[PDB]
Amino acid sequence: GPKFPRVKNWELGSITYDTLCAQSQQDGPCTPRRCLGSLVLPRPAEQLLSQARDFINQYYSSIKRSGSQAHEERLQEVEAEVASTGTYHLRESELVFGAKQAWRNAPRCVGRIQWGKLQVFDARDCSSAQEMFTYICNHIKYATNRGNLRSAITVFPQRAPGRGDFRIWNSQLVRYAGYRQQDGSVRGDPANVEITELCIQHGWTPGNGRFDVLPLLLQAPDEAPELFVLPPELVLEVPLEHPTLEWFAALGLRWYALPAVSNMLLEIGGLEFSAAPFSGWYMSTEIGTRNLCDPHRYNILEDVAVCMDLDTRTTSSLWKDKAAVEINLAVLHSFQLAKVTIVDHHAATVSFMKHLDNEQKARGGCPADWAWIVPPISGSLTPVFHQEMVNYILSPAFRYQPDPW
Amino acid sequence: KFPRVKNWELGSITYDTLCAQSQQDGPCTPRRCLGSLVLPRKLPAEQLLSQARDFINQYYSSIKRSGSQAHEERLQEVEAEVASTGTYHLRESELVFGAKQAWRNAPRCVGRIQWGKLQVFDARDCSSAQEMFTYICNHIKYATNRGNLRSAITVFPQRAPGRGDFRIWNSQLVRYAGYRQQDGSVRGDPANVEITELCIQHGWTPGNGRFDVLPLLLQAPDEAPELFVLPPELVLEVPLEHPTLEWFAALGLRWYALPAVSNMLLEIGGLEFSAAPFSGWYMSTEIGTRNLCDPHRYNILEDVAVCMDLDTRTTSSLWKDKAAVEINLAVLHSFQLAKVTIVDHHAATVSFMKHLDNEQKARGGCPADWAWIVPPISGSLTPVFHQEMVNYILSPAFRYQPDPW
Ligand code: HEM
Ligand code: HEM
Ligand SMILES: N=C(Nc1ccc(CCNCc2cccc(NC(=N)c3cccs3)c2)cc1)c1cccs1
Ligand SMILES: N=C(Nc1ccc(CCNCc2cccc(NC(=N)c3cccs3)c2)cc1)c1cccs1
Ligand SMILES: C[C@H](O)[C@H](O)[C@H]1CNc2nc(N)[nH]c(=O)c2N1
Ligand SMILES: C[C@H](O)[C@H](O)[C@H]1CNc2nc(N)[nH]c(=O)c2N1
Ligand SMILES: [Zn+2]
Questions:
Q1: What is the C-alpha separation between B241 and B251, in angstroms, rounded?
Q2: Could you tell me if residue A207 is left (phi over 0), alpha (psi between -120 and 50 degrees) or otherwise beta?
Q3: Catalytic site residues of B?
Q4: What is the 8-class DSSP label of residue B221?
Q5: What does the angle CA B136 – CA B137 – CA B139 come to, to the nearest 5 degrees?
Q6: Residue B165 gets which letter from DSSP?
Q7: What is the rounded distance in angstroms from the CA atom of residue B189 to the CA atom of residue B291?
Q8: Which residues partner with A201 through β-bridges?
Q9: Which helix (H) or strand (E) holds B154?
Q10: Out of A76, A172, A257, B95, which could bridge A236 as a Cys pair, Cβ 3.0 to 4.6 Å?
Q11: Contact B28 A38 (CB under 8 A)
Q12: Has A30 been labeled as part of a binding site?
C-alpha cells in the first residue's frame, strides 16, 4: 500500500492513510524506541522567513491564487519587511485565515467541526492594559450573547524584538478562586491556587466562597500586570440542578458559561501572538466529570454518592460511575434549562467523526490526540474510541508558553 | 534524554530509565505519533545469538547468580547449539522465567501486579493436535478451578526453520459463535464470524443461538487443523442478572468465566512459541462495556435502555451511559453470586498504580500503553487516567502473528 500511516477504524472496519502528516516540520516527543503520546507537556532571519513563506503559501492556496502574481508580490514584501526590520506584519485576512487554521490544526480539540466559524477580533492596535480589558469585555459580551454562545478570538499585538509581551496572566477569562486553608485543604478550585495568590499579591481583596470569580491580571509591554474586576453581569453562570433528584440543587453547585482560554500562544507564519484569548462552548464532561469530579478539583463524587445513598465503602458498587453519570446529566439539564449552549460527549464525538471525514477529503488527514479526544467518561460508548488517530504538529498552531512570572 | 513521567493528580514525577533497554522499535517517529494504532505497521545466527545471550543474562541475573560457572557454561551451551544448528532450546526453569517476564513486559496489560503468580505448563513434548487438546483441557481445568480462577500458560513447541507452526486457530479457548445472515447481519458474537465459518467448513455442525461455544481448530505442523469440541463441563459460564432490575435476567445474557488468549506469539531469547495459550481472569469492563456494548459486538445498549425506560431519542439524556453502568453492575453482581473470580476497573487500576510503583523501584520504569490501561468507561474516575506512561517494547514479549489461514 501507500507509504503513509495507515489509520483504521475498528467499529466500521474502514482504513484511510494520513498524507497530511508529511506537511509537519515540527517534531513531536515520540521516537522508534519509545512512545510519549500520553504526556501532557513533554519538553533568526532566515528561520522566520522560511516559516513566513510557508504560511504565505498556505494562504494563497486557501484562496486558490498559488503561483499568482499577487502571491509572489506578497512573498517579496514579506522578505523586504524582514530584510529591514527583522520582523513582518500580517494582512487582516491573513490573520483571520491563520487563526482558523490554528484551531483546525489543534490535535487535542474535539470541537473542530466548527473551525470555519470563528469571529476574529483584530486587537493589534491595543497599547495599554486598560484597553486590553475593554477588548476582553467586548469579547465576552459578543461570545456570551445571552447564552447563545459564539466562537471568538481576540488577537493582541504580536511579540516584538526587545519590547516586552502582551500577556493575560490568568489561564482562562473566567476562573473560580482557590483559597489554601489553615489545614492545607482548599476552598474553591484547587486548579487556581497560584493565580489566586498572585491576584492577592497584586492587591486583590480575596473573598471566601467556593465559586468566587477571579479578577484578571493583564500585562502590557514592559509594565507590571494590572488588576481588573469583571463586572458581575458580564459573567453568565448556570446554577446546577438535576432533572429528577430534587436535592441536587441544594448542593449549591454552579459553573460559568463561557470557556475562554487565555494563556496560549498563537503562532502564525513564525509570528508570535502571546496574548490571544479564544472562546467557544463547553462539552459537558469538562464540567461534570473533570472540573467537578477530579480528585484534585472540586472532588464532589463522594458527596453526590452519599446523597444518592450508594455504597461508597466498596468499589464494586460502581458508586463512582453512577454519581458521575448523574452529575453529567445535571450539567446538561441545567445548561439546557438556562438556554446556554453546551454539547454532550456523544454529540461532540459524532460531529468530530464527521470532521475527520471532511478533513480526509480536504487535506488527507487530521492531526489528533486520541487520549484527549476520547471523553473521560463512557469512552468506548463514543465512536472516537474505535478510531485510530495520528498526532503531529502543524502550523499555524496554538502552543503552551511559559507563565509570565 | 530519558522520559520524565508525571502524575497530574498527585503532582509526583519519576524518570523512566528502563526504556533504554528496548532493542525493538514501535510505530512512532519524531514527525508523527501512532500510539493509538492497534496493530503494528510492519505486520541470522548473530542476531539470534545476541537475543539469546541477553535472555540468558536476564535469567542468571534473576536468580542472583550472574558470573557463576553455571552462567558461563550455559552461555557456551547456547552458543555451541546456535553455531551448529541455527537454533537452541530452553531449559524448563528458563521457560518459566521467560513467560513471567513476557507478561511483566506487556504494555497493554492492567493485571501485571499478578505477574509473579503464573502456573507454567511445559507442553513442548507435544507431537499432534490430539495431544495439544489434552494439554488444553488440562489447562482449562487447572485454570478454572471451579471459579477460583488461577493464572496459567501452556507452551507448545517452538517455531522451527524447517517447518510449519503449531497453532491454535481460535483467538481464545472460549468463543461464542457468530452466524452471518443472508441479510449480512450477525447472530452471536460478530467478532467470531470468520472462525465460526472456518469451523463449519472443517466439519462442525453449527448451532443457532447467541451463545454457542465454538469447537477448537488445532493445527500440528504442516497439517490441516483438526476440530475438537470442548466438554461442556470444562466451560464454566455465568448467567447474567441484575441485583435490583428483575427483568435483566430475562435478557438471557451470559458470559464465560475464563479468558484464555490463544493466538499470540510468545518470544523468549529470540525463540518463538506460536502456540502458548495463556489465561487469568476478567476485568468486568471487558464483558460489561466492550463485549456486550460495543456496536460491532453484541450491541445491547438500546435493548437495556428500552427496558429501563430511558429516553433513547436524544444523546443528551445520557441513556447510553446509564445502561452501560447497569450492565457492568450486572456482570460484577453475577460473577460474585457465581463465586467466580473477577475484578472491577477501580480495583484493577488501583492495583496497577501499585504495580507502576513496585516496578519503578525494581527496574526503573514500566512500559504501559495508556489507551489500553485506562478503562472504557469512567476513565478519569480511575487513577490511571491521570498518570503519564511510556510505551515501549521489552523482550521477552507476547506479540501478534498472522492468522494461519
Ligand atoms: C466550538 C466549541 C468547542 C468545543 C466544544 C471545544 C471542545 C474542546 C475540548 C473538550 C477540549 C479539551 C479540553 C480539556 O480537556 O481541557 C478542547 C481543546 C482545545 N480546543 Fe476546543 N472546542 C471548541 C472550540 C475551540 C475554539 C474556538 C478554539 C480556538 C480558536 C479551540 C481550540 C482548542 C485548543 C487549542 C485546545 C487544546 C488545549 C490544550 O492543549 O491544553 N477549540 N476543545
Ligand atoms: C490475572 C488477571 C489479569 C487481568 C485482570 C488482566 C487484564 C488485562 C486486560 C483487561 C487486558 C486488555 C484486554 C482487552 O481489552 O482486550 C489485558 C491485556 C493483556 N494481558 Fe492481561 N490480565 C491478567 C493476566 C494476564 C496474564 C496471565 C497474561 C499472560 C500471561 C496477560 C497478558 C496480557 C496481554 C499480552 C495483554 C495484551 C493483549 C493485546 O495486546 O492484544 N495478562 N490484560
Ligand atoms: N497545570 C499545568 N499545565 C496545564 C496545561 C494544560 C492544561 C489543559 C488546558 N485546558 C483548558 C481548556 C483548553 C481548551 C479548551 C477547553 N474547553 C473548551 N470547551 C474551550 C475553551 C476555549 C474554546 S473551546 C479548556 C491544564 C494544565 C502546569 C504545568 C507546570 C506547572 S502548572
Ligand atoms: N484481529 C486482529 N487484531 C486484533 C488485535 C487485538 C485484539 C484484542 C485482543 N484482546 C483479547 C484479550 C487479550 C488479553 C487479555 C484479555 N482479557 C483478559 N483478562 C485475559 C486474557 C488472558 C489472561 S487475562 C483479552 C483483537 C484483534 C488481526 C490480526 C491480523 C490482521 S487483523
Ligand atoms: C496523563 C494524561 O495525558 C492526562 O491525564 C490527560 C488524558 N486526557 C485528557 N484529555 C483531555 N481532553 N483533557 C485532559 O486534561 C486530559 N488529561
Ligand atoms: C483505536 C484504539 O486504540 C482502540 O479502539 C483501542 C483503544 N483502547 C483499548 N483498550 C483496551 N484495553 N482494549 C482495546 O481493545 C482497546 N482498543
Ligand atoms: Zn507515540
A1: 9
A2: beta
A3: 109, 112, 281, 286
A4: T
A5: 60
A6: P
A7: 8
A8: none
A9: strand B152-155
A10: A257
A11: no
A12: yes
Resolution of the model in angstroms: 2.1
* DSSP-derived 3-state class of residue A278: strand
Ligand 2, pocket-test mutation among B108, B331, B351, most atoms within 8 A of CB: B108
Q: Is B367 helix (H, G, I), strand (E, B) or coil?
A: strand
Partnered with residue B152 across adjacent β-strands are: B119, B279
Say what angle helices A69-85 and A45-62 make with each other, to 10 degrees.
160
Q: What share of chain A is helix, strand, coil (3-state, %, to 5)?
A: 40, 15, 45
Q: Which residues surround ligand 7, an ion (CB under 5 A)?
A: A 30, 35, 37; B 28, 33, 35
B380 Cβ closer than 6 Å to some ligand 5 atom: no
Distance CA B269, CA B48 (A): 8
What amino acid is encoded at B289 in this protein?
A: T
A74, A112, A159, A167: the catalytic one is A112
Measuring from atom 16 of ligand 6, which residue has the nearest CA?
B372
State the amino acid at position A88 in one-letter form.
Y
A286 is catalytic: yes
Coil/strand/helix, residue B228: strand
Say if CB B125 and CB B251 are below 8 A apart.
no
Return the residue matching grid coordinates 490463544. B262
Q: Which residues sit with their C-beta closer than 6 Å to ligand 2?
A: B 103, 106, 108-111, 114, 118, 151, 153, 264, 278, 280-281, 283, 286, 343, 372, 398
Whether the ω angle into residue B190 lies within 30 degrees of 0, i.e. cis, is no
Please tell me the distance between residue A398's alpha carbon and the centre of ligand 3 in angstroms: 11
Question: Which chain B residues are within 8 Å of A36, Cβ to Cβ?
Answer: 3, 33, 390
d(C-alpha A135, C-alpha A122), whole Å: 10
- Residue A188 gets which letter from DSSP? E
Residue B238 grid coordinates: 455465568
Q: Give the three cell numbers for residue A213.
A: 470569580
**Closest residue in chain A to residue B320, using alpha carbons only:** A381
Contacts of B93 (CB under 8 A, 6+ apart): B59
| Measured distance between the N- and C-terminal CA atoms of chain A, rounded to whole angstroms | 51
Q: Do the Cβ atoms of A258 and A279 come closer than 8 Å?
A: yes
Method: X-ray
Could you give the CA distance from residue B196 to residue B189 in angstroms, rounded to a whole number?
Answer: 10
HSE (side-chain half, CA atoms, 13 Å) at A36: 25
What interhelical angle do A319-338 and B319-337 show, nearest 10? 170
Residues in chain A that come right before a backbone break, where C and next N are over 2.5 Å apart: 43
Q: Which of A31, A299, A332, A381 should be substituted to probe chain B, the one whose Cβ sees the most B Cβ atoms within 10 Å? A: A381
Half-sphere exposure of residue B379: CA atoms within 13 angstroms, side-chain side? 25
Domains and CATH numbers, chain A: 18-124+151-161+265-279+349-373 (3.90.340.10), 125-150+165-236+400-404 (3.90.440.10), 237-259+282-347 (3.90.1230.10)
Residue type (1 letter), B361:
K
